[PDB]
Amino acid sequence: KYTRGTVTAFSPFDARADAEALRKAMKGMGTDEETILKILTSRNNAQRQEIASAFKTLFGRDLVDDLKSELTGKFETLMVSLMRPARIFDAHALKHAIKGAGTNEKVLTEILASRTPAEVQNIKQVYMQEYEANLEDKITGETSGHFQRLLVVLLQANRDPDGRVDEALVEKDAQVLFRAGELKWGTDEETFITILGTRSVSHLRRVFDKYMTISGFQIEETIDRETSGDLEKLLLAVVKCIRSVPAYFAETLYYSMKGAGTDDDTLIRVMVSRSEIDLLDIRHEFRKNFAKSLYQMIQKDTSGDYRKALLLLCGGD
Ligand SMILES: [Zn+2]
Ligand SMILES: [Zn+2]
Structure with missing residues (x-):
């Protein structure tokens, strides 16, 4: 919210x-x-x-x-x-991500898994107006399999709006998912893509909690963090964003600087694309979920003018 x-x-x-x-x-x-x-x-x-x-x-x-x-x-x-301009960022981000040899199956995830319906219907429109092509096609051309199907489902920006509680369906979905989430998300994908792709957020938040009661653990558990393929990667990005988008980006920022080197691209994409939406929340999440200061991290992992900027966009001290 x-x-x-x-x-x-x-x-x-x-x-x-x-x-x-x-x-x-x-x-x-x-x-x-x-x-x-x-x-x-x-x-x-x-x-x-x-x-x-x-x-x-x-x-x-x-x-x-x-x-x-x-x-x-x-x-x-x-x-x-x-x-x-804030209006073409994603479109442009997506273009340079599906353009030429080598496809950024990650930028496609991040964006299509975090942007809102209004924001996505916008991307699709911009992409046509500016580049004069079709995001869907340009997407289905560099993507394949259930991964593509899920990517396309998201592109429709038709997730079910939030509403009353269908306890029955929440039990149904939880179960349905669980079975396929024990089969390492490989058996009958079409159905969990539908559920995770279209059900309202309020509804999924709920399926998550019950699935926790049915299996004894969270759903992000079944999917291997770094390993797995783009689908699991997207399945995992979808779930993260349903729970708390800010939490999603703070985790993306965490992994962007943790370890060997630094994925400056992402750091730059995240810090900007979120600057005017939830970055101030992302910052609060980061700390709460990592026992560490986002600022201090950017502070200790970059330098020069590049750094001075970031740290400001980060909220200063
Ligand atoms: Zn460009
Ligand atoms: Zn707090």
Whole structure:
């Protein structure tokens, strides 16, 4: 339900003033990252668009082009993302994820498993308007099997809305799932895809709790964390998001920095795409579910301008 983001409109807003600052910072002989990141992070997406607008109206130049022309590395990637209109992010994220050789079966999961129905019907529309193609097809072209079917079920954005309680059905679903969730999720997929894919959230939250009574343990148990295939990966992403989306992203952020190296891509995708929706909740979850500070982690795992930004989007100290 209701959640807080980390980025909220800036006041007193002045696109033009902001536009010249960025220009001044980028123009001339040197590049003043400090100012740029202090501006893009404290200004929300709807404001970066206006800033971008003023920027051109005053200089005949293209703000985003100009940013890509002066910035580099991750700080560049971060900065350019926070600028990407909030309306095409997923569509664009999805395009560069199904484009060319090698398919990001993970970005497809994250997005299609976390976005809302309104948000998804939007993705589909954007993808056509901007790229002039069909997300479904472009999806069914790089996907196959039950994985694809589940991916497609989600794409429809027709999950059953929340409502009264059908105790009968909750027992039915729990059981039905359980059997197939003991067969290592390989026997009769069509049916658990239907249940996990379309039932209301309030309903599934409930099937989860009963299935806990039928098997003696949670459902995320049956599915191997890292191992398994894209389906299990998606089955697991669906369940996580039904329970608590913020919990889902805090876990994704956790694994993004834990271990060998750091999956900066995801870190950048998560931190941005959530900045104005639930990042402030994700932050609270992280701690509660990991006995560790999300901020301090980003703090101790990155550096430079790249870091200064992130830590702000993270909510500062
Ligand atoms: Zn691109
Ligand atoms: Zn708390």
